[PDB]
Design a protein around this ligand. Structure first.
Ligand SMILES: *[C@@H]1O[C@H](CO)[C@@H](O[C@@H]2O[C@H](CO)[C@@H](O)[C@H](O)[C@H]2NC(C)=O)[C@H](O)[C@H]1NC(C)=O
Ligand SMILES: *[C@@H]1O[C@H](CO)[C@@H](O[C@@H]2O[C@H](CO)[C@@H](O)[C@H](O)[C@H]2NC(C)=O)[C@H](O)[C@H]1NC(C)=O
Lengths: 250, 250
């Protein structure tokens, strides 16, 4: 297999993350059974590493699903760390990584051995090794739920320094989230196209792939807007380049 | 008891934080038994809620003790969240909360029932209810170790907008960390007096309590320097005040 082996101590981490997240939930929905949640997730670890479908995680979702505050959803592509850092544990925004069912698996890997019953810590199938592996099918199901339950102002953070452009036509955002947005409960979609400090400006609002994304969103009838290097996030990026002309203060 | 009662699901959170932190440790010091570490921590939990001494966590420390990179220690007072956020999980600096024995207990509470084998999820003694309570004794032992294991350039983040002064003369830094610094392996000490955006300038370098701190450190033979609103941290504060004049970019 051509992808990371399952994460060491998967269960403790999962349960730990789940416990800490409960505290964030409001009491009226704080009653989440982390053990039951782990057992529903655990199902994919009993199947063939190439025979897991997004629907296998349905129970998991039912047991961990909770509401996402209006105008608090934050989608993204090629900016994982900047998103978690900026969102700051649900304080600023609530991206998938900061929603119960996403928090428990963020950055982790998992899959069962090809022929044995135990977990494969050596490697796990990549989308290329086979389409229906545990990790991809997981995110597809989680990405779908996240989009469906998002409302208000939809924020999206894309990478303008990414060599393949800011919008991957075949990413999770394009194939599993955009098609699941409830236009009925979405006011407008705002995009933040970020560039590395000094780093390359491969694409800015309205250029290359950004035209394709913008066109799709507008055809689907969404109110659309795009901002290059949205200030708050730029300031966070700047923390690591305090002495760079782009980061100098008045 | 007047302080917060023990954290719900304390064991799962503990083991989860411990397992996750293991990945951040050097392969040489990656051999950490979380379960064993927990059992050691529990040795203080089985005692009377007002009869726990720092020495009770000696075993805990022993089994979780790991080295701290040179020049990466970051001490502080009245700026817990700003430090955790700036340290960015051992990426920039490694504060007590980003060291194994600190990470497993950051923000949590714990204590045995006044008179019963179970944990008291109702309330835990504060420093007033009694001095030798589980939580305060914990941080004393942890602070002493963190201090003893620090080296190179020592950094300290203080809140210059703190009504009672930047340097608490009766806090953990003053009573349990400064006394334990190893001058022999310390090059210099640098202070960062931070102020809230716009917030009050109660004290700055060379004023009030700062005069006391500087004089104490100089009397001990350390090289000293103090910076007002250290830039990188300022930028991080600015993330939440992007439009404020103190945060305008050039
Ligand atoms: C935005 O995309 C760029 C380009 O892919 C990322 O920067 C690269 O990151 C890799 C892995 O750390 C490095 O090997 C390259 O040297 C980087 N290139 C450049 C030009 O910096 C960047 O990390 C992405 N930004 C975020 C927030 O994810
Ligand atoms: C620095 O100290 C100030 C003053 O104690 C802190 O700000 C106060 O925090 C309390 C508790 O949340 C608020 O109710 C007050 O409104 C705040 N006042 C002011 C003037 O800010 C501040 O949180 C501290 N900064 C850090 C980073 O810990």
């Amino acid at each position: 297999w051509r992808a990371e082996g399952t994460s060491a101590h998967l269960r403790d981490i999962f349960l730990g993350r789940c416990a800490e997240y409960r505290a964030l939930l409001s009491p009226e929905q704080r009653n989440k059974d982390c053990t039951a949640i782990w057992e529903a997730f655990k199902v994919a670890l009993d199947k063939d590493p190439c025979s897991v479908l997004p629907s296998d995680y349905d129970l998991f979702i039912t047991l961990s699903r909770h509401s996402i505050p209006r105008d608090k959803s934050l989608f993204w592509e090629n900016s994982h760390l900047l998103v978690n850092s900026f969102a700051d544990n649900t304080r600023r925004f609530m991206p998938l990584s900061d929603v119960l069912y996403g928090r428990v698996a963020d950055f982790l890997s998992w899959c069962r051995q090809k022929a044995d019953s135990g977990l494969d810590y050596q490697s796990c199938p990549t989308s290329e090794d086979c389409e229906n592996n545990p990790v991809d099918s997981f995110w597809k199901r989680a990405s779908i739920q996240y989009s469906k339950d998002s409302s208000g102002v939809i924020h999206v953070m894309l990478n303008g320094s990414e060599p393949t452009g800011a919008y991957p036509i075949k990413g999770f955002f394009a194939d599993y989230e955009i098609p699941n947005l409830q236009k009925e409960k979405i006011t407008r979609i705002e995009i933040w196209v970020m560039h590395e400090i000094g780093g390359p400006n491969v694409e800015s609002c309205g250029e290359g792939s950004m035209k394709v994304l913008e066109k799709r969103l507008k055809d689907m009838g969404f109110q659309y807007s795009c901002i290059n290097d949205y200030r708050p996030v730029k300031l966070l990026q700047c923390v690591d380049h305090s002495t760079h002309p782009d980061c100098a203060l008045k």
